[PDB]
Design a protein around this ligand. Structure first.
Ligand code: NAG
Lengths: 48, 42
């Protein structure tokens, strides 16, 4: 669907997930926007 | 991913006896469930 899901300036509407605490179980949907806790220090709900 | 409810009614600690349960409702919702609570009519 390159003729309907792409734009010259870039289509940023579609987003995916790159980091999560654990693997998803089959037939599960996650829409949580919580910041990933990569380190021990809490993210405090902000990037860093 | 389905919610199955079986129910039974009877006239009367739980009593001694056998009474099987019939199926009423299957809700094809499919939501991750971890807790639950009940509601009374005060
Ligand atoms: C369901 O929620 C509980 C709450 O902590 C979580 O531990 C569990 O991993 C969740 N399961 C799925 C399949 O989302």
């Amino acid at each position: 669907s390159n003729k309907l899901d792409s734009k010259v300036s870039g289509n940023y509407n579609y987003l995916y997930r790159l980091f999560r605490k654990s693997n998803l179980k089959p037939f599960e949907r996650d829409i949580s926007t919580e910041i990933y806790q990569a380190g021990n220090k809490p993210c405090n709900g902000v990037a860093g | 991913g389905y919610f199955k409810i079986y129910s039974k009614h009877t006239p009367i600690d739980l009593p001694q006896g056998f009474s099987a349960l019939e199926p009423l409702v299957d809700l094809p919702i499919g939501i991750n469930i971890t807790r639950f609570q009940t509601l009374l009519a005060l």
